[PDB]
Amino acid sequence: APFGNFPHYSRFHPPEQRLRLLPPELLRQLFPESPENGPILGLDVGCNSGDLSVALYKHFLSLASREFRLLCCDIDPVLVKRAEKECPFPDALTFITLDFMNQRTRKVLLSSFLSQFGRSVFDIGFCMSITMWIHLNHGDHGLWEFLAHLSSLCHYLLVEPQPWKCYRAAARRLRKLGLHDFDHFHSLAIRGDMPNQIVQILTQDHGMELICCFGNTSWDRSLLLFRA
Ligand SMILES: Nc1ncnc2c1ncn2[C@@H]1O[C@H](CSCC[C@H](N)C(=O)O)[C@@H](O)[C@H]1O
């Protein structure tokens, strides 16, 4: 699993103590309630086995005027269709297999999904614990391009950057497991304060402003909310 496609990542830190400081009223606190805008469209990048996506859907409190549709994508197809067969809400969550660092696949599938509601772009994006894997697999330039695509693809963006602590463990686990091919740990110049580095990249470069954060940047894991 070089892209970090660990089966059932949910055994690793539980959904509940990654959203305990996340307000359930977030969907109420971010979007108007006029139904003319249509459903609230979320893009969950990196839905390992649907656990955290289902938990995010069950966690947010609805508006009772619009409905929350969530397109979740992942690079491992077996994991995606497991998430499909394990998923409580069929008519609310749509699972697809996508390598987000592929222009053609991403453009085609994301326009196929958003054509169903008009929706030139998404409403809210979810980038939970995928930053480090995009980084390790495509260098600083791939992290930059990933954040750029998500900034120009979403109105709001809830990123969970993995700290530099996890980088060492992941790089060791990949180097020893005959997979140092999917690892640029040496050539990474963006380092140390991954939350603040993501903040600076999404702020100076991609026209987004940090409007919320739940957790400390020096904590276990911090959640960071940007808006275009
Ligand atoms: N280029 C890429 N495009 C899409 N998904 C990717 C990707 N690289 C990695 N992923 C997916 O991103 C996930 C990161 S693991 C995090 C799982 C989930 N976000 C959670 O926090 O519970 C992995 O399951 C992997 O399958």
Short mmCIF file of C-alpha atoms and ligand atoms in Angstrom, two decimals:
data_model
loop_
_atom_site.label_atom_id
_atom_site.label_comp_id
_atom_site.label_asym_id
_atom_site.label_seq_id
_atom_site.Cartn_x
_atom_site.Cartn_y
_atom_site.Cartn_z
CA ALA A 1 0.00 0.00 0.00
CA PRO A 2 2.30 2.78 -1.22
CA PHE A 3 -0.48 5.35 -1.68
CA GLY A 4 -1.51 4.70 1.93
CA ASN A 5 -4.41 2.43 0.91
CA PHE A 6 -4.44 0.59 4.22
CA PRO A 7 -7.58 -1.61 4.33
CA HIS A 8 -9.96 -0.38 7.02
CA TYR A 9 -7.98 2.66 8.18
CA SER A 10 -10.78 3.06 10.72
CA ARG A 11 -9.05 0.58 13.07
CA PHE A 12 -6.37 3.27 13.20
CA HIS A 13 -7.56 6.38 14.96
CA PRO A 14 -11.33 6.33 15.34
CA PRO A 15 -13.63 8.78 13.58
CA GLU A 16 -14.95 10.09 16.89
CA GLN A 17 -11.71 11.63 18.20
CA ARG A 18 -11.03 13.36 14.94
CA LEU A 19 -14.41 15.13 14.83
CA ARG A 20 -15.13 15.62 18.56
CA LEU A 21 -14.00 19.23 18.15
CA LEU A 22 -15.71 19.44 14.76
CA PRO A 23 -19.09 21.19 15.12
CA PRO A 24 -22.04 19.10 13.87
CA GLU A 25 -23.67 22.40 12.80
CA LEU A 26 -20.87 22.99 10.25
CA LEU A 27 -23.20 22.35 7.30
CA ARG A 28 -25.63 24.78 8.95
CA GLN A 29 -22.86 27.31 9.70
CA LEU A 30 -21.48 27.48 6.14
CA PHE A 31 -24.26 27.34 3.56
CA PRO A 32 -27.43 29.34 2.86
CA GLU A 33 -30.75 27.59 3.29
CA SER A 34 -32.44 28.69 0.07
CA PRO A 35 -33.10 25.39 -1.78
CA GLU A 36 -32.65 27.13 -5.15
CA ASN A 37 -28.91 26.51 -4.75
CA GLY A 38 -29.69 22.78 -4.73
CA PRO A 39 -28.12 20.03 -2.64
CA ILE A 40 -24.90 20.56 -0.71
CA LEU A 41 -22.19 18.82 -2.73
CA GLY A 42 -19.17 17.41 -0.89
CA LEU A 43 -16.04 15.82 -2.33
CA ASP A 44 -14.35 13.38 0.06
CA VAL A 45 -10.85 12.76 -1.33
CA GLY A 46 -9.40 9.54 0.05
CA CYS A 47 -12.31 7.47 1.38
CA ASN A 48 -10.32 4.42 2.52
CA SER A 49 -13.20 2.08 3.44
CA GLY A 50 -16.04 4.60 3.75
CA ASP A 51 -15.84 4.54 7.57
CA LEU A 52 -14.78 8.16 8.02
CA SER A 53 -17.02 9.30 5.16
CA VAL A 54 -20.07 7.62 6.71
CA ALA A 55 -19.08 9.09 10.08
CA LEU A 56 -18.74 12.59 8.59
CA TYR A 57 -22.19 12.20 7.04
CA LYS A 58 -23.72 10.97 10.32
CA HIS A 59 -21.92 13.71 12.27
CA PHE A 60 -23.06 16.85 10.44
CA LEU A 61 -26.51 18.13 11.38
CA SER A 62 -28.78 18.57 8.38
CA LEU A 63 -30.50 21.81 7.41
CA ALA A 64 -34.02 20.41 6.73
CA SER A 65 -34.17 22.51 3.54
CA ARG A 66 -31.27 21.21 1.43
CA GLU A 67 -29.81 17.71 1.29
CA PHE A 68 -26.16 16.72 1.70
CA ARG A 69 -24.82 14.65 -1.21
CA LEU A 70 -21.24 13.40 -0.81
CA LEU A 71 -19.06 11.99 -3.60
CA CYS A 72 -16.22 10.01 -2.05
CA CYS A 73 -13.22 8.90 -4.10
CA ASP A 74 -10.30 6.56 -3.46
CA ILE A 75 -7.44 5.06 -5.44
CA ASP A 76 -7.89 1.42 -4.34
CA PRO A 77 -10.87 -0.10 -6.21
CA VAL A 78 -11.27 -3.08 -3.86
CA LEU A 79 -11.49 -0.66 -0.93
CA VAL A 80 -13.95 1.56 -2.82
CA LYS A 81 -16.42 -1.21 -3.57
CA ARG A 82 -16.00 -2.58 -0.05
CA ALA A 83 -17.02 0.89 1.16
CA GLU A 84 -19.94 0.56 -1.26
CA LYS A 85 -21.07 -2.77 0.19
CA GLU A 86 -20.53 -1.56 3.76
CA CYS A 87 -22.26 1.78 3.42
CA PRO A 88 -25.45 2.60 5.29
CA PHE A 89 -26.53 5.50 3.07
CA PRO A 90 -26.76 4.51 -0.62
CA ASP A 91 -28.68 7.61 -1.83
CA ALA A 92 -26.38 10.07 -0.03
CA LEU A 93 -22.82 8.79 -0.57
CA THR A 94 -21.39 7.85 -3.97
CA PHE A 95 -18.10 5.94 -3.98
CA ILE A 96 -15.72 6.04 -6.97
CA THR A 97 -12.19 4.86 -7.72
CA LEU A 98 -9.98 7.79 -8.72
CA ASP A 99 -6.28 8.69 -8.77
CA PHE A 100 -6.69 12.39 -8.00
CA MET A 101 -3.25 13.13 -9.51
CA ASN A 102 -4.56 12.11 -12.95
CA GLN A 103 -6.10 15.04 -14.81
CA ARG A 104 -8.23 13.02 -17.25
CA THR A 105 -9.77 10.62 -14.73
CA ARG A 106 -10.50 13.38 -12.20
CA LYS A 107 -11.96 15.85 -14.72
CA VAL A 108 -14.17 13.21 -16.34
CA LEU A 109 -15.53 11.56 -13.19
CA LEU A 110 -16.00 14.79 -11.22
CA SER A 111 -17.84 16.44 -14.11
CA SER A 112 -19.93 13.29 -14.51
CA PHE A 113 -20.95 13.55 -10.86
CA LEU A 114 -21.58 17.31 -10.73
CA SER A 115 -23.57 17.36 -13.99
CA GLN A 116 -26.38 15.71 -12.00
CA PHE A 117 -27.08 19.00 -10.17
CA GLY A 118 -25.64 21.71 -12.46
CA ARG A 119 -22.80 22.52 -10.10
CA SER A 120 -19.81 23.73 -12.09
CA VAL A 121 -17.80 23.03 -8.89
CA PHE A 122 -18.25 21.42 -5.46
CA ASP A 123 -19.64 22.93 -2.26
CA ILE A 124 -17.32 21.49 0.41
CA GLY A 125 -14.23 19.30 0.11
CA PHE A 126 -12.83 16.86 2.68
CA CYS A 127 -9.07 16.21 2.69
CA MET A 128 -8.76 14.01 5.77
CA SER A 129 -5.29 12.48 6.17
CA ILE A 130 -4.39 12.33 2.48
CA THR A 131 -1.93 15.23 2.40
CA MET A 132 1.04 13.11 3.48
CA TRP A 133 0.35 10.42 0.88
CA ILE A 134 0.01 12.86 -2.02
CA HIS A 135 3.24 14.41 -0.71
CA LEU A 136 5.19 11.15 -0.49
CA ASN A 137 3.95 9.97 -3.89
CA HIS A 138 4.42 13.15 -5.95
CA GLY A 139 6.85 15.45 -4.12
CA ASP A 140 6.29 19.06 -3.13
CA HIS A 141 5.03 19.79 -6.64
CA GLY A 142 2.33 17.13 -6.37
CA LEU A 143 1.25 18.43 -2.98
CA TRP A 144 1.08 21.93 -4.50
CA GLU A 145 -0.90 20.72 -7.52
CA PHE A 146 -3.27 18.68 -5.32
CA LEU A 147 -3.99 21.67 -3.08
CA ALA A 148 -4.42 23.86 -6.18
CA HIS A 149 -6.96 21.52 -7.77
CA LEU A 150 -8.89 21.25 -4.51
CA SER A 151 -8.83 25.03 -4.02
CA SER A 152 -10.17 25.63 -7.54
CA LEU A 153 -12.62 22.72 -7.13
CA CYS A 154 -14.29 23.51 -3.78
CA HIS A 155 -15.84 26.51 -2.06
CA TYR A 156 -14.94 25.27 1.44
CA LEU A 157 -12.13 22.85 2.26
CA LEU A 158 -11.67 20.81 5.45
CA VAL A 159 -8.05 19.58 5.40
CA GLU A 160 -6.47 17.24 7.97
CA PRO A 161 -2.71 17.53 7.37
CA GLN A 162 -0.62 14.75 8.81
CA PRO A 163 2.31 16.13 10.83
CA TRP A 164 5.95 15.52 10.04
CA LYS A 165 5.93 12.82 12.74
CA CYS A 166 3.94 10.43 10.54
CA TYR A 167 6.31 11.09 7.62
CA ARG A 168 9.19 9.22 9.27
CA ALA A 169 7.07 6.17 10.12
CA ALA A 170 5.45 6.04 6.67
CA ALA A 171 8.78 6.45 4.87
CA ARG A 172 10.36 3.67 6.93
CA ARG A 173 7.37 1.39 6.37
CA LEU A 174 7.60 2.05 2.63
CA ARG A 175 11.39 1.77 2.27
CA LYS A 176 11.60 -1.51 4.19
CA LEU A 177 8.57 -2.93 2.35
CA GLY A 178 10.44 -2.90 -0.98
CA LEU A 179 8.51 0.24 -1.93
CA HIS A 180 10.99 3.12 -1.71
CA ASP A 181 9.84 3.89 -5.27
CA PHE A 182 6.75 5.72 -3.97
CA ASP A 183 8.78 7.90 -1.59
CA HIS A 184 10.41 11.30 -2.09
CA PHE A 185 11.21 11.89 1.55
CA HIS A 186 14.72 13.07 0.69
CA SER A 187 13.64 15.58 -1.97
CA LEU A 188 10.84 17.17 0.10
CA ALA A 189 11.64 20.81 0.87
CA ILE A 190 8.27 21.53 2.45
CA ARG A 191 8.69 20.23 5.98
CA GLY A 192 8.14 20.53 9.72
CA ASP A 193 4.91 22.47 10.12
CA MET A 194 2.69 20.67 7.56
CA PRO A 195 -0.45 22.39 8.93
CA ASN A 196 1.10 25.84 8.54
CA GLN A 197 2.78 24.84 5.27
CA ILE A 198 -0.61 23.80 3.87
CA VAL A 199 -2.02 27.08 5.23
CA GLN A 200 0.65 29.15 3.49
CA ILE A 201 0.24 27.26 0.21
CA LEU A 202 -3.57 27.55 0.20
CA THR A 203 -3.35 31.21 1.29
CA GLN A 204 -0.54 32.85 -0.69
CA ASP A 205 -0.89 30.73 -3.83
CA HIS A 206 -4.45 29.38 -4.18
CA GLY A 207 -6.70 32.28 -3.15
CA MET A 208 -8.13 30.62 -0.04
CA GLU A 209 -8.37 32.04 3.47
CA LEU A 210 -8.26 30.02 6.69
CA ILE A 211 -11.56 30.69 8.48
CA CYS A 212 -11.62 27.89 11.07
CA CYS A 213 -9.46 25.34 12.86
CA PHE A 214 -10.38 22.74 15.49
CA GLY A 215 -7.26 21.54 17.27
CA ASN A 216 -3.69 22.72 17.66
CA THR A 217 -1.17 22.68 14.83
CA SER A 218 1.27 21.02 17.26
CA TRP A 219 -1.31 18.46 18.43
CA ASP A 220 -1.98 14.85 17.41
CA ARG A 221 -4.08 15.88 14.40
CA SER A 222 -5.59 19.27 13.57
CA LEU A 223 -8.52 20.12 11.30
CA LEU A 224 -8.22 23.26 9.16
CA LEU A 225 -11.09 24.95 7.30
CA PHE A 226 -10.37 27.14 4.26
CA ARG A 227 -12.71 29.09 2.00
CA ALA A 228 -12.14 30.33 -1.55
N1 LIG B 1 -3.86 10.04 -5.68
C1 LIG B 1 -4.90 9.63 -4.91
N2 LIG B 1 -6.17 9.81 -5.32
C2 LIG B 1 -7.21 9.41 -4.58
N3 LIG B 1 -7.09 8.81 -3.39
C3 LIG B 1 -5.87 8.56 -2.86
C4 LIG B 1 -4.68 8.97 -3.61
N4 LIG B 1 -3.63 8.61 -2.86
C5 LIG B 1 -4.10 8.03 -1.74
N5 LIG B 1 -5.44 8.00 -1.74
C6 LIG B 1 -6.31 7.45 -0.68
O1 LIG B 1 -6.32 8.33 0.44
C7 LIG B 1 -6.47 7.58 1.64
C8 LIG B 1 -5.61 8.18 2.74
S1 LIG B 1 -5.87 7.25 4.20
C9 LIG B 1 -7.09 8.24 4.99
C10 LIG B 1 -8.42 7.50 4.97
C11 LIG B 1 -9.57 8.42 5.37
N6 LIG B 1 -9.37 9.73 4.78
C12 LIG B 1 -9.60 8.55 6.86
O2 LIG B 1 -9.00 9.51 7.38
O3 LIG B 1 -10.21 7.69 7.52
C13 LIG B 1 -6.06 6.16 1.33
O4 LIG B 1 -7.13 5.27 1.65
C14 LIG B 1 -5.82 6.11 -0.16
O5 LIG B 1 -6.61 5.05 -0.71
#
